Design a protein around this ligand. Structure first.
Ligand SMILES: *CC(=O)NNC(=O)c1ccccc1Cl
Length: 225
């Protein structure tokens, strides 16, 4: 369990910033709304790894929601091809993602899913798939991202340098794009060391979340409501 941990009580993360006044207050506040946490490895891939594990976990035993998600996943090669990715170069990563979706369906256990996301090879193939899909979705909707995010940004260079390569850190744009690309509703709780409110953002604005993430020190951990 070196990539995604066993479930721990929320207050078990006080030990990560001992005698830190503000961290202690915000973690105590968070413990009133959430029961448990899983920790992720800080290797630059933890947003993709955390979202992929937590969303698939949320599908276990839900036969309609699994069917709908599989239908969307089967179309994702078309998104990749429209953005200029070649099938022979994305094949291995798409096959790995489809495989773990089938595991959710056929096996249906937390323990089997956690074993795949802690297998360095399977887990990294899943992350690489999610990175290529994020890049495709941004590229195919370049005018949307320029209009609403940043009129001055270079979309092709940002995707080449800050989305596709393993171990590149995320910002707001990659979170919005992957949420939209897979229709995953997520809530991020923000914990910094400033004497401010514990606060959250929902992706997209409307939504009832499937996934809750804690963001704390360029890092994303998984929360349980
Ligand atoms: C989400 C993710 O992997 N964040 N990365 C880290 O936690 C990290 C990687 C390199 C140096 C420092 C840190 Cl915090």
């Amino acid at each position: 369990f070196n990539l995604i941990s066993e479930k721990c009580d929320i207050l078990s993360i006080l030990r990560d910033h001992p005698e830190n006044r503000i961290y202690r207050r915000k973690i105590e506040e968070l413990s009133k709304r959430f029961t448990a946490i899983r920790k992720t490895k800080g290797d630059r891939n933890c947003f993709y790894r955390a979202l992929g594990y937590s969303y698939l976990e949320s599908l276990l035993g839900k036969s309609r929601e699994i069917f709908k998600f599989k239908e969307r996943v089967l179309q994702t090669p078309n998104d990749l091809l429209a953005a200029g990715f070649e099938e022979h170069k994305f094949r291995n990563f798409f096959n790995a993602f489809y495989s773990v979706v089938e595991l959710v369906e056929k096996d249906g256990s937390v323990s089997s899913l956690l074993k795949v996301f802690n297998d360095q090879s399977a887990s990294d193939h899943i992350v690489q798939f999610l990175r290529l899909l994020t890049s495709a979705f941004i590229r195919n909707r370049a005018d949307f991202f320029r209009h609403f995010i940043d009129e001055e940004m270079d979309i092709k260079d940002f995707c080449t340098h800050e989305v596709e390569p393993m171990a590149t850190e995320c910002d707001h744009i990659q979170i919005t794009a992957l949420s939209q690309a897979l229709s995953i509703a997520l809530q991020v709780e923000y914990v910094d060391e400033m004497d401010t409110a514990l606060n959250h953002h929902v992706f997209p604005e409307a939504a009832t979340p499937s996934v809750y993430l804690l963001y704390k020190t360029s890092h994303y951990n998984i929360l349980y409501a």
